[PDB]
Amino acid sequence: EFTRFVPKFKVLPYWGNPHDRKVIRRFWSAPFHVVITSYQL
């Protein structure tokens, strides 16, 4: 829905293997427009 509704907003998903998620967290640690994460995460 974000990748199609508007070609402006940038998503930075946060759900997956500890490695990928840690890398994503390190990234912004600014294009972090929107973030997608689960309740448990």
Partner DNA sequence: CCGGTGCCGAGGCCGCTCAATTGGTCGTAGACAGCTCTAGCACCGCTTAAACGCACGTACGCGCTGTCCCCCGCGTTTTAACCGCCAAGGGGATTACTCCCTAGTCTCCAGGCACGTGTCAGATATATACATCCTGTGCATGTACTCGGGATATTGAT
- Binding residues vs DNA (CB under 7 A): 15, 18, 22, 25-26, 29, 38, 40-41
Instruction: Could you list the beta-strand ranges (E) of 1-41.
Output: none
Q: In the chain, count H helices and then E strands.
A: 2, 0
Question: Which residue lies nearer to DNA by CB, 6 or 38?
Answer: 38
CB of 25 to DNA, least distance (A): 6
Strand-pair partners of 9: none
Structure tokens at 13: 């998903």
Q: Between 5 and 40, name the residue whose CB sits nearer to DNA.
A: 40
Kindly tell me which of 9 and 27 has the beta carbon lying closer to DNA.
27
